[PDB]
Amino acid sequence: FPELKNDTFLRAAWGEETDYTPVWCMRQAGRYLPEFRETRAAQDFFSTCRSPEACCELTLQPLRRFPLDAAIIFSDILVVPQALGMEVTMVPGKGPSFPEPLREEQDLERLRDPEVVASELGYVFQAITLTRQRLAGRVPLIGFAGAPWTLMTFMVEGGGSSTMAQAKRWLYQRPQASHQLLRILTDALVPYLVGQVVAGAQALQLFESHAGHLGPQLFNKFALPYIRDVAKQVKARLREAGLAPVPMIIFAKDGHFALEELAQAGYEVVGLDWTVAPKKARECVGKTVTLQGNLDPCALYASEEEIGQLVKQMLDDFGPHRYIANLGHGLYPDMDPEHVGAFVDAVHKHSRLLRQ
Amino acid sequence: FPELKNDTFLRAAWGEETDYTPVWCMRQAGRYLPEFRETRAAQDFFSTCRSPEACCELTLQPLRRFPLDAAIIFSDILVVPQALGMEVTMVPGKGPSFPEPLREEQDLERLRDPEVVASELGYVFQAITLTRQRLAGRVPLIGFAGAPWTLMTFMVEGGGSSTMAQAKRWLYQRPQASHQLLRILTDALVPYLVGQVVAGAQALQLFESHAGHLGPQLFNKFALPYIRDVAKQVKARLREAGLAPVPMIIFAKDGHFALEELAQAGYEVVGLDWTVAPKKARECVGKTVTLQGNLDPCALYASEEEIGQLVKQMLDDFGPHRYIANLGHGLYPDMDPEHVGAFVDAVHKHSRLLRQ
Ligand SMILES: Cc1c2[nH]c(c1CCC(=O)O)Cc1[nH]c(c(CCC(=O)O)c1C)Cc1[nH]c(c(CCC(=O)O)c1C)Cc1[nH]c(c(C)c1CCC(=O)O)C2
Ligand SMILES: Cc1c2[nH]c(c1CCC(=O)O)Cc1[nH]c(c(CCC(=O)O)c1C)Cc1[nH]c(c(CCC(=O)O)c1C)Cc1[nH]c(c(C)c1CCC(=O)O)C2
Questions:
Q1: Residue A139: which of A211, A59, A195 has the closest Cα?
Q2: How many angstroms separate the CA of residue A134 from the nearest CA in chain B?
């Protein structure tokens, strides 16, 4: 691959000092961009995900508008449950659905052996290689997947939920079958994430987007062990294959209660939602992980001047060390690309002023 | 399409006698026109190129001011390297840039298969069809592209250069990789140029704008073969598709040294810069190609009366046969539209006096 030119994001992820704070945005390839909507109108969602050229194009679009310090491959976390043998749709304007969710223990029999999942996800690896080549070393490329618990919630609920009552009912009433499913997911995720790195990914983020539905006791029993396993096994396999391990980011949205445990879970970077005060997060995680985040995505509805001031305040709280800027979740479809631009420029501007 | 009403430019290109000398100007759709600047202020440069209506409008603007004998579609030669997978910007007042130029052989791996480029340039074909329809047969519409060597220089240098030292270093140190790249470009250009004709173009010009950096030995080894290939293959494909081949113009700026070879390269018309005395050019190319050019664009800074006299002298040197008037390069942004008008009127006036 082409030599990396701007490695600020990677240096920051490993905790090294940098000249400015690197920034990227979750869902930077997203519907808030008119050009994203146009490229997407061509195919259906999961068909877009299966076209390396389409994925590459969507990945590059934000970088043409903004000097973001990382790209993230266009894909979706739900490709893993799909590759395990579940059928999944993107309903017109009503999000992901599994018309036949997992509801009893016997339903696990329908899933593929987790060891064959990576072979089913070749299309993602093709997209990663192509995007890495086309990026031509501009900035690092992040690969990603959903965390076991979060993927379990989609598989059991059949979509989004305000309570995760069915998935949590599994945890309390079917603890053994839950662990079995969480292990299947872990065993699928590890080779998939390794394959993403083999294909060209230079960092990995694991999205535990539905952490907040668990309190600490269930999180520690059912989510944390598998989060830890994913990091340990991915690093081991990469070492063994003669490759360099990449920085790994754990993002547990609404996971305020788990920050101390997440800082010990074998990830270089702990991603934060907007509800956690940066200084409180720093006390929780300690001095040797990098934090990522955490501006309220809705702050981007404010004026460009206001966004600059909110960014300044955020960066004052995080300080110059061991920090990668981002929002506290993904960009929303109704947001203004110019305000995303203002966010990026302000992180760059204020982080330089904070140093010198 | 509407039937062509004024075909003088085409008759002259094929070498037929005409009642007056037809004239057009390189960069006639350009910044010297206040109305060009206004229409352009709407979008960024490459976004203008992707709007058929914007391209059509820019193409027609000069024709509303001046009785030019041809239109040339508004586009840019750099759409080809873009469609091959390189990222390219139009920097505010500092021209084209590729932030990640090709610098080693392995960088060729990032490019698209040349056979898929035409599909990426549909927007240009749409602009051509629309402009041909809106022109309503007034005058012929010229399509165009950059020549392989010249496109290679942009791809390797990452922009303009006073020496082409990096691209020439490729020719001397990486001859094989250079030929590989020049072949990729040729194989992309042929289907693109054919598609321009399919879409409505009635003539084609290939811009070898950076010929002059090569002497004769390198030009014959690395530029000429691909110039020849482009013409041979475009004509073959058009024949085979049941379409009429169009006149093709090769313009090698600062290519004094290559005129004899260019006259044998399969182009109806050889375009000249202002440094070549017309009578010397005529001896070089012989009696069976048409010459195009060649007034110093800077001559348009002279008074309207002076421009008339310079034009008279130019036309005396070229003579009435096998000649299409133009400047020796494109119009510059600070030139006066009224002086462009004087140029057009003088060619028409003096060429009629030269015949009768
Ligand atoms: C709406 C939706 C989709 N997929 C999903 C949803 C949410 C469903 C729910 O919560 O009930 C499922 C999903 N996809 C992704 C996540 C993790 C993000 C999180 O919730 O923390 C989740 C939970 C990451 C992603 N989803 C996507 C990426 C690729 C990276 C990028 O787009 O920049 C990632 C990491 C791409 C994607 N995927 C989808 C769209 C429309 C897009 C474009 C971005 C947008 O406009 O929202 C469909
Ligand atoms: C400044 C620039 C542009 N594009 C380019 C440059 C020069 C870069 C360099 O030499 O370092 C690259 C380019 N574009 C074109 C050429 C070939 C002309 C030549 O050098 O012989 C080249 C070398 C043709 C063109 N470039 C364009 C056309 C369309 C036809 C027309 O505009 O009449 C062609 C054939 C349009 C264009 N393209 C651009 C502008 C501003 C315009 C409007 C015309 C003007 O004011 O200069 C941007």
A1: A59
A2: 6
The best mutation among B36, B76, B80, B88 to test binding of ligand 2, ranked by most ligand atoms within 8 Å of the C-beta, falls on B76
CA A288 to chain centre: 21
Q: Distance between CA A274 and CA A297 in Å, rounded?
A: 8
CATH number of A1-356: 3.20.20.210
Whether residues B107 and A136 touch (CB distance < 8 A) is answered with yes
Q: Give the three-state DSSP class for B70.
A: coil
Domain boundaries, given as residue ranges, for chain A: 1-356
Q: How far apart are CA B305 and CA B311, in angstroms?
A: 10
- Packing angle, helices B224-240 and B148-157, rounded to 10: 120
Question: Could you give the maximum distance between any two Cα atoms of chain A, in Å?
Answer: 62
Distances (CA, A) of B20 to B63, B223, B314, B344: 18, 34, 14, 12
Triad A309, A311, A315: Cα angle to 5° = 120
* Mutation for A interface: B110, B112, B116, B119, most A CBs within 10 A: B110
**Residue type at A287?**
K
Instruction: Ligand 2 pocket test: pick from B50, B77, B294 the residue with the most ligand atoms within 8 Å of its Cβ.
Output: B77
Interface probe, candidates A35, A55, A63, A133, chain B, greatest B C-beta count within 10 A: A133
Q: Are strands A248-252 and B323-327 parallel, antiparallel or unpaired?
A: unpaired
Question: Which residues in chain A are closer than 8 Å to B100, comparing Cβ atoms?
Answer: 2, 5, 135-138
DSSP state letter for B38:
H
Strand runs labelled E in A286-349: 290-295, 323-327
Resolution in A: 1.7
Please report, to the nearest 10 degrees, the dihedral formed by the alpha carbons of residues A325, A330, A333, A334 taken in order.
-50
A75 within ligand 1 shell (Cβ under 6 A): yes
CA-based torsion, B313, B318, B321, B326: positive or negative:
negative
Q: By CA distance, what is B47's nearest residue in A?
A: A35
Beta bridge partners of B90: B96
CA distance B265 to B270: 10
Give B267's contacts (C-beta < 8 A, 6+ positions apart): B206, B231, B248, B249, B250, B289
Query: Of all helices (H) and strands (E), which one includes residue A269?
Result: strand A269-271
Count CB-CB contacts under 10 A for residue B141: 24
Give the other-Cβ count within 10 Å of A34's Cβ. Answer: 10
d(C-alpha A106, C-alpha A99), whole Å: 17
CB B300 within 8 A of CB B314: no
Going from the Cα of B82 to the center of ligand 1, the distance in angstroms, rounded, reads 29
Q: Which atom of ligand 2 is nearest to the CA of B209?
A: 21
Q: Measured between beta carbons, which residues in chain A are less than 8 angstroms from residue B87?
A: 60, 64, 134, 136, 138
Exposure string (b/e) for A220-237, b if CB count within 10 Å is 16 or more? Answer: eebbbbbbbbbbebbeeb
Could you tell me which residues of chain A have a Cβ less than 8 Å from any Cβ in chain B? 2, 5, 60, 64, 133-138
Residue A40 Cβ < 6 Å to ligand 1: no
Count of CB atoms within 10 A of residue A94's CB?
10
- CB of A96 within 6 A of ligand 1: the answer is yes
Q: Residue B159 class from Cβ within 10 Å (0-12 exposed, 13-18 middle, 19+ buried)?
A: middle
Subunit contact A134:B110, Cβ cutoff 8 A: yes
